[PDB]
Amino acid sequence: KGEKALKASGLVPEHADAFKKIARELNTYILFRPVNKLATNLIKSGVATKGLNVHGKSSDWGPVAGYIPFDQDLSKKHGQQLAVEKGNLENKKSITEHEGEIGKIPLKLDHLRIEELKENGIILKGKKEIDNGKKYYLLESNNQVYEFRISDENNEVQYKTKEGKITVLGEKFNWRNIEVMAKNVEGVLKPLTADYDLFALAPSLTEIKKQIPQKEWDKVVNTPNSLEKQKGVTNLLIKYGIERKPDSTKGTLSNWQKQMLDRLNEAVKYTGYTGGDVVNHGTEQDNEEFPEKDNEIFIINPEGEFILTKNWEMTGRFIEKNITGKDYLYYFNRKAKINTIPTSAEFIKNLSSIRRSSNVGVYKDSGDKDEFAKKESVKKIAGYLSDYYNSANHIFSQEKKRKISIFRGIQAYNEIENVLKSKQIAPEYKNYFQYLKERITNQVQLLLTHQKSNIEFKLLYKQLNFTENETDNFEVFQKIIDEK
């Protein structure tokens, strides 16, 4: 937190000041994932950010790294040489996937990066041998097994391993240029560096009132009881935010999220960033290739405070206290899962990920009555896990979101118990359902003990019996929970 936030985060300071300017002019409470200072100097130099095109991110070492490489030894597979062939294959399909707009331009080198990285002990002051017939600035890298040779007189990088050592790889790569990816912004090609990353946003209710047309907000003026407000915010979210297009250009967003991110990101056009959108993809919850546990997040408010958190459970504490605990909606990109679980889209993603290795189970590759019956059960299960995050009923206190979340979770639990009266299923999907039922009972119990009323869980499961209606049983749920 503070200037320690911006230095242990690793971002541009004047980008943060431009974000403060556009936040003071727009009033949106966005978040940021920290990107290191190895690529940040190249953001200040002029080469802009990548998108969601290559998902093997750049290393945390290397004076020539920061850009996404074709040979992924300059990526996170450092020393794990059996995966560098799959890295070359994945960057072959990353090249051949985004064709039409991509070119082949290498890194634009500078002498200033290696003098600003003198702290690694890059130059050994021993013998000065003229290798390859050229006056070379002799550098010794972080290790002896591979040297990352930046050129001195060539615009292209002349990186080449030594001609007297042997490794376990065997592919002594020649003095070629680096093969990093490209993107055509306003006609001129540009290399791609480590992209900036965000987490969420929580805009003010008058900004949503002025960004969504006025009829939906003259609806808000005549809302006496909270169930009609629940219906209004839910069908607003259905007619606006369910159109999540799975894309690989700018990130899995909606329309208004994209245009407000563009209006929040255009503030660097007069500061020194020649690209505009400094974040060209979604989050890491929106990057579905590898689930990265984000250890710390960067907090940006329109008031002007710089907070970088420490712990992940404390990050969820900050979210549920500042975002959800007050009158602000939690517009996040949608045994140890206490409060925030992977959402309904991630639920279907986990379902497919277990489905790819499980041949049989609950329902198989056919269309019978139990098959499509448990298919409609799991689509309404996904609907209930989606409506579990009904974080827009914040007109009264957080207890209202608590009781609505418990109502949706108990509907989900009754759906799970409706599913388990079927045929003899495979043990993979069986203990999948066991983990889901244990997680949902522990979540509903630890929310019930947090909120009110000291009731058991099985008591609330036994007293609640809903068959074909949910606007009547919310009254008996309110009669049990409230009005003691």
Side-chain angles (χ1 to χ4, degrees), residues 1-359 361-367 369-484:
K1 44 206 191 319
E3 195 39 57
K4 189 192 60 70
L6 277 299
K7 195 53 66 144
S9 158
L11 296 202
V12 178
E14 70 182 0
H15 280 38
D17 292 282
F19 289 157
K20 294 286 102 172
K21 182 270 292 183
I22 192 55
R24 283 172 52 111
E25 296 210 10
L26 211 62
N27 195 210
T28 318
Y29 283 75
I30 63 188
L31 298 179
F32 286 93
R33 180 194 155 207
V35 195
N36 39 47
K37 208 67 81 175
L38 270 180
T40 314
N41 176 85
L42 318 168
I43 311 303
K44 266 186 59 52
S45 309
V47 289
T49 56
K50 76 195 162 186
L52 196 134
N53 62 316
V54 176
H55 327 97
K57 263 76 203 176
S58 307
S59 295
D60 281 297
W61 44 265
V64 306
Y67 310 96
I68 42 176
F70 192 72
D71 47 351
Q72 297 266 307
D73 191 26
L74 188 136
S75 294
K76 68 201 69 171
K77 276 79 68 178
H78 153 77
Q80 321 159 341
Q81 318 276 354
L82 270 298
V84 311
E85 308 300 286
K86 301 158 59 178
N88 282 77
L89 176 47
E90 83 183 1
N91 221 324
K92 177 58 174 200
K93 70 208 188 52
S94 314
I95 283 294
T96 43
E97 191 211 357
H98 306 264
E99 279 304 331
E101 61 153 0
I102 187 174
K104 213 57 154 156
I105 48 171
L107 70 88
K108 318 296 172 186
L109 85 168
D110 71 317
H111 307 265
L112 274 55
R113 184 105 168 274
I114 202 53
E115 59 196 70
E116 288 156 332
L117 177 50
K118 277 294 144 193
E119 289 79 29
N120 78 97
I122 180 67
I123 313 302
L124 72 172
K125 215 43 182 173
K127 42 161 192 62
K128 284 309 270 205
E129 56 91 18
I130 309 193
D131 68 327
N132 319 103
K134 199 170 61 60
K135 187 263 169 204
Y136 173 63
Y137 191 55
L138 267 75
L139 68 89
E140 188 45 62
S141 65
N142 56 329
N143 53 5
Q144 204 89 342
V145 76
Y146 274 131
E147 57 178 1
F148 290 87
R149 295 211 285 164
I150 179 154
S151 315
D152 315 326
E153 307 78 10
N154 281 334
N155 197 327
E156 274 60 62
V157 65
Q158 199 253 340
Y159 73 106
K160 160 77 187 87
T161 192
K162 304 170 195 281
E163 296 92 9
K165 56 188 194 186
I166 54 171
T167 176
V168 72
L169 197 51
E171 189 60 47
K172 330 288 168 188
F173 46 87
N174 202 359
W175 40 67
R176 71 206 171 199
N177 50 25
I178 201 77
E179 313 186 39
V180 310
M181 276 54 70
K183 176 173 302 185
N184 263 298
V185 174
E186 61 204 80
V188 180
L189 265 174
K190 216 189 298 175
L192 297 192
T193 330
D195 187 12
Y196 274 30
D197 213 317
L198 56 90
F199 205 63
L201 74 160
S204 159
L205 265 75
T206 184
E207 193 203 353
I208 314 148
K209 170 190 159 290
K210 67 162 190 92
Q211 86 197 3
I212 284 177
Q214 190 49 283
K215 153 211 69 184
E216 282 102 1
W217 316 109
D218 305 294
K219 176 247 296 177
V220 186
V221 194
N222 284 315
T223 57
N225 193 49
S226 198
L227 278 79
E228 303 87 314
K229 181 49 69 206
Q230 162 197 355
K231 295 322 154 187
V233 304
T234 49
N235 65 3
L236 192 139
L237 203 44
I238 302 306
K239 306 176 321 296
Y240 285 154
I242 71 149
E243 53 181 1
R244 193 63 68 89
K245 269 81 63 188
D247 40 18
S248 192
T249 318
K250 310 280 284 185
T252 53
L253 284 68
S254 67
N255 48 76
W256 84 91
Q257 284 186 359
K258 197 60 209 177
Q259 66 207 59
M260 256 61 85
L261 207 168
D262 288 23
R263 210 211 181 272
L264 267 170
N265 221 330
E266 51 90 31
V268 290
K269 274 303 309 172
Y270 81 116
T271 77
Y273 188 75
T274 43
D277 210 13
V278 78
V279 181
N280 299 306
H281 66 263
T283 69
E284 263 307 312
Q285 207 200 316
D286 268 7
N287 272 257
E288 63 267 10
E289 292 88 13
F290 60 99
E292 179 258 342
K293 179 152 292 194
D294 176 81
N295 51 349
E296 48 203 357
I297 210 66
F298 186 45
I299 295 93
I300 281 300
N301 57 339
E303 181 75 355
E305 306 317 299
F306 306 139
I307 312 300
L308 181 70
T309 184
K310 272 80 59 186
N311 218 13
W312 159 251
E313 54 90 20
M314 200 178 282
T315 305
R317 203 268 304 276
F318 293 149
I319 286 179
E320 77 197 280
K321 169 174 177 308
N322 314 133
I323 316 179
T324 321
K326 264 81 76 174
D327 204 20
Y328 280 105
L329 41 80
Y330 179 41
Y331 275 177
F332 81 110
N333 290 80
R334 72 181 311 172
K335 271 88 70 180
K337 325 291 161 306
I338 291 299
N339 208 340
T340 295
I341 71 155
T343 175
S344 46
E346 317 181 62
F347 151 75
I348 310 174
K349 192 91 175 175
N350 175 268
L351 168 62
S352 158
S353 315
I354 300 177
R355 197 193 299 199
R356 292 277 82 83
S357 298
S358 49
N359 42 68
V362 189
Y363 86 115
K364 322 171 197 67
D365 57 354
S366 65
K369 311 170 269 312
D370 211 2
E371 284 301 308
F372 273 15
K374 297 191 285 179
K375 182 63 181 173
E376 55 82 22
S377 79
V378 297
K379 68 91 185 171
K380 64 209 306 174
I381 276 157
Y384 282 141
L385 269 72
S386 62
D387 273 299
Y388 174 51
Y389 289 92
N390 203 5
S391 316
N393 309 305
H394 36 66
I395 314 289
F396 195 68
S397 86
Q398 46 161 342
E399 186 201 4
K400 277 285 171 287
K401 278 157 298 179
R402 285 332 201 276
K403 63 192 282 188
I404 285 159
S405 300
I406 292 316
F407 198 68
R408 299 313 193 176
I410 211 76
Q411 282 198 85
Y413 178 66
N414 219 334
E415 285 295 325
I416 305 301
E417 297 301 320
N418 202 338
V419 174
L420 268 73
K421 301 296 182 289
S422 182
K423 59 97 178 177
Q424 317 310 288
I425 49 159
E428 171 160 15
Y429 271 174
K430 184 260 292 180
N431 60 11
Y432 161 76
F433 275 164
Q434 293 299 109
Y435 183 79
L436 264 68
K437 68 95 180 177
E438 286 282 330
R439 213 169 58 149
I440 190 171
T441 65
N442 291 27
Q443 200 178 3
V444 71
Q445 175 77 87
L446 274 298
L447 204 153
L448 268 185
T449 66
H450 170 80
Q451 185 208 305
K452 295 295 155 296
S453 67
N454 316 102
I455 316 172
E456 276 271 330
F457 162 69
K458 292 307 185 300
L459 265 289
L460 264 177
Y461 168 66
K462 279 197 58 53
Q463 298 323 295
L464 280 188
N465 172 243
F466 58 97
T467 45
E468 281 88 40
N469 200 284
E470 75 169 358
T471 197
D472 49 2
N473 291 265
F474 198 64
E475 277 44 49
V476 66
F477 183 83
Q478 181 185 357
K479 195 203 52 153
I480 290 184
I481 292 296
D482 187 27
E483 69 258 32
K484 323 302 289 282

